[PDB]
DNA sequence: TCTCTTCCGCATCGCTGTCTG
DNA sequence: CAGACAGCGATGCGGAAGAGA
């Protein structure tokens, strides 16, 4: 639990 | 001096390369910049040595960046490091030799130290100097004679003109010595202050204190430490070690209150021996020695109250062993800097957490107080767990179409109220807070624009705080935030960054920013650095969001506002889009809602 | 009774020699 | 009718800027022949090069010169 | 890849290309997984066999590997249905191919290739060769337009520059073969030599060009015998990347520094190191010339110092993310030539024209709500002709 | 009647912005 | 560009009005 959010775990840039 | 076909300067013909270069992890540029390796087996030894003689400017994870200057070199001599003591090891550590320019610079800086010593005795400042020749050629400029009040040769100097003379000597190639020989000082009796065993000193805190106390005589300088690192504890320890009268100066009502608590909690000195020279309340300042005051009152320029007048006269007459000035970054301010000359102190230690500003007045802190003694490695503290790891991020919020049209159309500066208030960021913060709210994470919103802050709060019906907010309501809101589970977010205005004791928060969203102020960003960032009871560095439990609007002036400030943080090592990640925003229902989901806000924004004037 | 800081700088790099 | 020129597609934020350019006569002409969609517009071919230059100037304002 | 090259060839050239010494062997190694086995089985058979047997000789699982293999070799025309016996010439040649019938060199290849890239970039000091310059100019990666002035570098040149040496070299030789036919050099004769390496007038000229690229070196004043270099048959990284857009590269060869300067601002140059910063000015400058963010990330990734190999990903996310964003901003305004329509009296005609454009592919974008669309100038004549025909 | 507590009115600082040269 | 003045948002201080013993 207490896992990091998706938008911080991996780059959200379209690339 | 030599420029290659590209921008970089050429040093092929400048200095050689050591044959065992791989063994040596150190570089030395002619300009003084130094590049250390954080992967070398001997990194730690180099780090201590370079920190002693050089001040960091960039310490990323792999290759640190140090540059040395006259102020940096003088501090090294103060801790007993001679020119050969440093240059010899520097040449040994250097993998490419030492350019002659640095060699001569080191020699000139080291020799030009200790020749002129400034000592205050019986409320009189005497410029002592064992060598008489220094004084003979130092009186060429007429400023010295008019400045002066109308072996071991010394002469009294005017109190008011100390600051003017001090800066003059810096460029005169003869720095003044402000060491306090508290060990050998009978004029002012020692105060009954001791450090209880309960207080625990962290290794970096001890190193910072050790650097300050290079020898039996305390050195006057600035120690930059994170707010969550416990800079208050270090200040208390320095006062306890000095064992003489100390005058801690705050910057606001909250600052003075916390310092008194810090003194009592960590120092055995009795409550009655501590006074609060505060306009709101006082505890007989003349009665006791250890005092906590504020820059405004001491430097207050207008008519002084009778009771304050007596205290101010009492403060001026007496001589202080230590003058702790927290938040030194405000000292070079006109009124604030006058306080230095108003009061007399042997060594004026300075503590802070964000030693950065735009106007080039920070350099004055080198002579106003002294060289920057210590500046803790934020990244190393993160690894050691003393400071909560932060997943710094920058959420890019695309501007709504209509909003941009007025923003670009108008050449005025209503944009500050416009781009700070756009639907996408509102939905972004609304969505961002919602995600963290269900995660049991404590949120601390920020906004320079009170108008935007109020609008965001009422729409989200959250307890927004700001300047003219009543003190009682201010405390009530904070207590609920710390205790009440039903509420886990507080919308603080700029007053939050000034000075407070707020509970540790897992996240810190910032919908708006005052501007390109490295101070405010670092000030606000320090709030979440409060280490949790049992967290871990790699878990990245603490987060920081600095929402910005794309294709708007806000971007320029944000990039210009994060310069200080990246220098420490923090990596600001960009988030073009947030997953789950479309599915989640948020306000301003229709064109009409945005239109009303724009009309209200336009009607703001 | 003095403190460890008054003693002097640690000089961590002096241990290594070449 | 049939109209010559070029079609440019961009995010809605930029589209508004172009609408400001033609309305305010920044380039001196209403180069926007017609608005295909909220993210599409039509401009004369000859003025594309200068228009692209203006946008490049816009990026400089919203980007710090590191 | 080499498979793409052989795939696009006529049957007539293929069998001629299947020279006895090597080609029957070099094309064999290409056969990925199964075609190798099938080739040996029907290598001593003089009687063609039915097509059904081949289909049922691979289990139901992994049946796709069978179809791709058969399709791959059918293009190579190794066999014929004859109704699947192999080509007798290939069968004979292959049977003849199956029991029938150094340290200085790599440095030379490393050095010779490096100087070529130095000339490729605007290096004031570089090897001079008129044949080499024009070959690169007609290779599609350089344009001069003025013999007196040294040729510049086109957009494709930069993309080629940042490629890795194997892909860089392999593509370079690929253009050579295509241009060899244009200049009149026989493709088959020159091609067969490359295969023979991995085991006439044109040959001497062809070998001279190969010797110029650094793949081969006679070492005996241009004698008949040659000793191919490692590159003829077909390293640790040094760049250290920070989180503040700072690159510390342990580069002594001026080529590496020149490459890094293409997309970064250089700050200091130490004897065994150089400091560069990846700022908006540099990256967009590189993007303007023609590069795209993928090459830079790949180029930085491939030349990654061992220190940063421990961290995963090797390149810190922020640096990679920032580079990608900078290129995206440049192409925010996507320009596409087209012709607009206005004043549609009826939507039926507009819909019918839309269907006609869709069938011909002339349409680029359409707007049903506004009853308008855009057509490229190439299709403008077609739709205009359609409108005239009514 | 003090007494505290509290509330106007000055003055200051951070950073930026405006305005005429 | 540049120096002086000023705005918005924060801070401190010092002089005058309500509950409460």
Contact D24 B552 (CB under 8 A): no
Task: Report the C-alpha gap between C17 and E30 in whole angstroms.
Answer: 59
Distance B411 CA to F20 C1' (A): 18
Q: What is the largest CA-CA distance in chain A?
A: 29
Q: Which residues are in reach of strand G, CB within 7 A?
A: B 252-254, 278-280, 294, 296-297, 300, 302-305, 308, 448-451, 453, 466-468, 493-495, 498
For residue B184, count CB atoms less than 10 angstroms from its CB and return exposed for 0-12, middle for 13-18, buried for 19 or more: exposed
Chain E residues closer than 8 Å to B570 by CB: 243
Task: Report the C-alpha gap between E6 and D28 in whole angstroms.
Answer: 57
Task: Report the C-alpha gap between B250 and B262 in whole angstroms.
Answer: 13
Task: Report the C-alpha gap between E263 and B339 in whole angstroms.
Answer: 50
Q: Region of B284 please: left (phi>0), alpha (psi -120 to 50) or beta.
A: left
Rounded to the nearest 10 degrees, what angle do helices B253-266 and B231-242 cross at? 60
Q: Which residue has the tokens 């990846």?
A: E278
| Superfamily of domain D2-63, CATH level 4 | TFB5-like (3.30.70.1220)
Q: Where are the domains of chain D?
A: 2-63
- Which residues lie across from E248 on neighbouring strands? E240, E275
| E332 contacts chain D (CB < 8 A) | yes
Task: Report the C-alpha gap between B320 and B201 in whole angstroms.
Answer: 25
DSSP B8: S
Those residues of chain E whose CB sits closer than 8 Å to some CB in chain A are 293, 317, 320-321, 324-325, 328
* Interacting residues of B548 by C-beta distance below 8 A, sequence separation 6+: B394, B395, B396, B397, B554, B555, B558
Residue B384 is encoded by which pair of tokens? 């050691």
Chain C residues closer than 8 Å to B52 by CB: 9
D3 backbone dihedrals φ, ψ, rounded to 5°: -125, 130
- Contact between B245 and B318 under an 8 Å Cβ cutoff? The reply is yes
- Contact between B38 and B46 under an 8 Å Cβ cutoff? The reply is no
Q: What is the largest CA-CA distance in chain D?
A: 49
Task: Report the C-alpha gap between E47 and D30 in whole angstroms.
Answer: 78
Task: Report the C-alpha gap between E5 and E9 in whole angstroms.
Answer: 8
Q: How far is CA E180 from CA B62, E4, E184, E186, in A?
A: 49, 17, 6, 7
Is chain A in touch with chain C: ≥3 Cβ pairs within 8 A? Answer: no
Residue contacts between A and B (CB atoms, under 8 Å): 30
Residue E231 is encoded by which pair of tokens? 């590159």
Contact B183 C16 (CB under 8 A): no
Angle formed at CA B392 by CA B387 and CA B393, multiple of 5 degrees: 165
Binding residue positions of B: 225-232, 527, 530
Nucleotide nearest to B330 (CA to C1'): F13
Nearest CA in chain B to E305: B62
Distance B520 CA to G9 C1' (A): 13
Question: What is the full DSSP assignment across B67-116?
Answer: E--HHHHHHHHHTT--HHHHHHHHHHHBSS---HHHHHHHHHHHHSSSSE
For residue B175, count CB atoms less than 10 angstroms from its CB and return exposed for 0-12, middle for 13-18, buried for 19 or more: buried
Beta strands, E only, B376-532 = 390-397, 443-446, 489-492, 509-510
Within 7 A of a protein CB, which nucleotides of strand G?
8-15
Task: Report the C-alpha gap between B436 and E267 in whole angstroms.
Answer: 42
Residue contacts between B and E (CB atoms, under 8 Å): 78
Task: Report the C-alpha gap between B475 and B484 in whole angstroms.
Answer: 13
Radius of gyration of chain D, Cα coordinates, nearest whole angstrom: 12
Binding residue positions of B for ATP: 225-232, 527, 530
The chains found to touch A (3+ Cβ pairs under 8 angstroms) are: B, E
Task: Report the C-alpha gap between E320 and E301 in whole angstroms.
Answer: 10
Q: In the sheet that D32-37 helps form, which strands lie side by side, from edge to edge?
A: D32-37, D40-43, D6-9, E334-337
Task: Report the C-alpha gap between E190 and E137 in whole angstroms.
Answer: 21
Resolution in A: 4.3
Q: Which of E244, E308, E325 sits opposite B574 (nearest CB)?
A: E325
Technique used = cryo-EM
Pure H helices in chain E: 2-7, 11-17, 23-30, 35-41, 51-55, 63-76, 88-97, 103-120, 130-136, 155-162, 165-183, 187-197, 201-213, 230-233, 254-261, 280-289, 293-302, 317-330, 347-360, 377-389
Task: Report the C-alpha gap between B375 and B352 in whole angstroms.
Answer: 10
Distance D19 CA to F16 C1' (A): 29
Q: Which residue has the tokens 């179409």?
A: B401
E216-224 contacts at long range (C-beta below 8 A, 24 or more positions apart):
E217/E105, E217/E108
Chain A residues closer than 8 Å to E316 by CB: none
- Contact between E90 and E78 under an 8 Å Cβ cutoff? The reply is yes
Q: Tell me how close the Cα of B18 comes to any Cα of chain C, in angstroms.
A: 14
The chains found to touch E (3+ Cβ pairs under 8 angstroms) are: A, B, D
């Amino acid at each position: 639990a207490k896992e990091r959010p998706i938008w911080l775990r991996e780059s959200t840039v379209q690339g | 001096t030599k420029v290659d076909e590209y921008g970089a300067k050429d040093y092929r013909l400048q200095m050689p390369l050591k044959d065992d270069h791989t063994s040596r992890p150190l570089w030395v540029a002619p300009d003084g910049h130094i590049f250390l390796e954080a992967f070398s087996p001997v990194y730690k030894y180099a780090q201590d040595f370079l920190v002693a003689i050089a001040e960091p400017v960039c310490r990323p994870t792999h290759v640190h960046e140090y540059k040395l200057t006259a102020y940096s070199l003088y501090a090294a001599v103060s801790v007993g490091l001679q020119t050969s003591d440093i240059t010899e090891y520097l040449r040994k550590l250097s993998k490419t030799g030492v350019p002659d320019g640095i060699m001569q610079f080191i020699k000139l800086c080291t020799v030009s130290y200790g020749k002129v010593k400034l000592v205050l005795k019986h409320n009189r400042y005497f410029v002592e100097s064992c060598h008489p020749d220094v004084i003979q050629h130092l009186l060429q400029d007429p400023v010295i004679r008019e400045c002066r009040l109308r072996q071991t040769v010394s002469f009294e100097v005017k109190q008011e003109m100390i600051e003017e003379l001090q800066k003059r000597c810096i460029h005169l190639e003869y720095p003044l010595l402000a060491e306090y020989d508290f060990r050998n000082d009978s004029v002012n009796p020692d105060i009954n202050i001791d450090l209880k065993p309960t207080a625990v000193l962290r290794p970096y805190q001890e190193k910072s204190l050790r650097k300050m106390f290079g020898n039996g005589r305390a050195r006057s300088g600035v120690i930059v430490l994170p707010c969550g690192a416990g800079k208050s504890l270090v200040g208390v320890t320095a006062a306890c070690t000095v064992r003489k009268r100390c005058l801690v100066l705050g910057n606001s009502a909250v600052s003075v209150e916390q310092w008194k608590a810090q003194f009592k909690m960590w120092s055995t000195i009795d409550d009655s021996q501590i006074c609060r020279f505060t306009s709101d309340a006082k505890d007989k300042p003349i009665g006791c020695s250890v005092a906590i005051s504020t820059y405004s009152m001491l430097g207050h320029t207008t008519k002084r109250s009778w009771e304050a007048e007596r205290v101010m006269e009492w403060l001026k007459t007496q001589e202080w062993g230590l003058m702790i000035l927290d938040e030194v970054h405000t000292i070079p301010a006109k009124m604030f800097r006058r306080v230095l000359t108003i009061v007399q102190a042997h060594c004026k230690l300075g503590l802070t957490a964000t030693l950065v500003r735009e106007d080039d007045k920070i350099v004055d802190l080198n002579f106003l107080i002294g060289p920057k003694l210590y500046e803790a490695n934020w990244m190393e503290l993160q690894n050691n767990g003393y400071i909560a790891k932060v997943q710094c991020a920058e959420v890019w919020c695309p501007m709504s179409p209509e909003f941009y049209r007025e923003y670009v159309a108008i050449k005025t500066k209503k944009r500050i109220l416009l781009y700070t208030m756009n639907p996408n960021k509102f939905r972004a913060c609304q969505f961002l807070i919602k995600f963290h709210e269900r995660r049991n994470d404590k949120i601390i919103v920020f906004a320079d624009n009170v108008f935007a802050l109020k609008e965001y709060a009422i729409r989200l019906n959250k307890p927004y705080i700001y300047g003219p907010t009543s003190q009682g309501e201010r405390m009530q809101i904070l207590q609920n935030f710390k205790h009440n589970p039903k509420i886990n977010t507080i919308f603080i205005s700029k007053v939050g960054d000034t000075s407070f004791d707020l509970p540790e928060a897992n996240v810190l969203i910032q919908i708006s920013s005052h501007g390109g102020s490295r101070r405010q960003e670092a000030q606000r960032l320090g709030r979440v650095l409060r280490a949790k009871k049992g967290m871990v560095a790699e878990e990245y439990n603490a987060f920081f969001y600095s929402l910005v609007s794309q294709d708007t002036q806000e971007m320029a400030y944000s990039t210009k506002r994060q310069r200080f943080l990246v220098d420490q090592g923090y990596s600001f990640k960009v988030i073009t889009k947030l997953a789950g925003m479309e599915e989640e229902d948020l306000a301003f989901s229709t064109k009409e809602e945005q239109q009303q806000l724009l009309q209200k924004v336009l009607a703001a004037t | 009774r003095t403190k460890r800081w008054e003693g002097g700088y640690e000089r961590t790099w002096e241990i290594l020699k070449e | 009718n049939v109209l010559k020129g070029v079609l440019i597609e961009c995010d809605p934020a930029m589209k508004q800027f172009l609408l400001y350019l033609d309305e305010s006569n920044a380039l001196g002409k209403k180069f926007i022949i017609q608005d295909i969609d909220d993210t599409h517009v039509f401009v004369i071919a000859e003025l594309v090069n200068v228009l692209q230059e203006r946008v490049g100037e816009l990026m400089d304002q919203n980007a710090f010169s590191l | 890849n080499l498979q793409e090259f052989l795939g696009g060839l006529s049957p007539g050239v293929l069998d001629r290309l299947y020279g006895h010494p090597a080609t029957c062997l070099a094309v064999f190694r290409e056969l990925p997984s199964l075609a190798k086995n099938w080739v040996m089985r029907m290598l001593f058979l003089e009687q063609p066999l039915p097509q059904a047997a081949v289909a049922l000789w691979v289990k139901k699982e992994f049946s796709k590997a069978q179809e791709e293999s058969t399709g791959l070799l059918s293009g190579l025309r190794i066999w014929h249905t004859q109704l699947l016996i192999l080509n007798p010439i290939f069968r004979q040649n292959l049977r003849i191919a199956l029991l029938g019938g150094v340290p200085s060199l790599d440095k030379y290849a490393e050095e010779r290739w490096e100087v070529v890239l130095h000339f490729m970039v605007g290096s004031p000091s570089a090897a001079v060769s008129q044949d080499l310059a024009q070959l690169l100019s007609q290779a599609g990666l350089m344009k001069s337009t003025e013999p007196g002035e040294p040729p510049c570098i086109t957009s494709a040149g930069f993309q080629f520059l940042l490629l890795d040496t194997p892909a860089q070299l392999w593509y370079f030789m690929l253009q050579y073969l295509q241009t060899a036919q244009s200049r009149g050099m026989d493709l088959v004769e020159i091609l067969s030599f490359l295969f023979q390496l991995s085991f006439s007038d044109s040959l001497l000229n062809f070998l001279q060009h190969l010797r110029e690229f650094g793949l081969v070196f006679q070492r005996k004043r241009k004698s008949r015998r040659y000793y191919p270099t490692r590159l003829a048959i077909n390293q640790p990284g040094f760049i250290v990347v920070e989180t503040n857009y700072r690159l510390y590269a342990y580069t002594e060869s001026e080529l590496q520094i020149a490459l890094i300067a293409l997309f970064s601002e250089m700050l200091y140059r130490f004897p065994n190191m150089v400091v560069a910063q990846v700022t908006r000015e540099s990256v967009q400058q590189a993007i303007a010339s023609g590069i795209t963010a993928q090459q830079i990330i790949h180029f930085l990734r491939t030349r990654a110092h061992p220190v940063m190999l421990k961290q995963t990903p090797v390149l810190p996310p922020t640096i990679t993310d920032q580079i990608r964003l900078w290129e995206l901003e440049r192409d925010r305004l996507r320009f596409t030539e087209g012709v607009l329509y206005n004043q549609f009296l009826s939507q039926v005609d507009f819909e019918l024209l839309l269907a006609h454009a869709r069938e011909l592919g002339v349409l680029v974008f359409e707007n049903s709500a506004k009853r308008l669309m855009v057509v490229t100038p190439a299709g403008h004549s077609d739709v205009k002709r359609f409108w005239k025909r009514q």
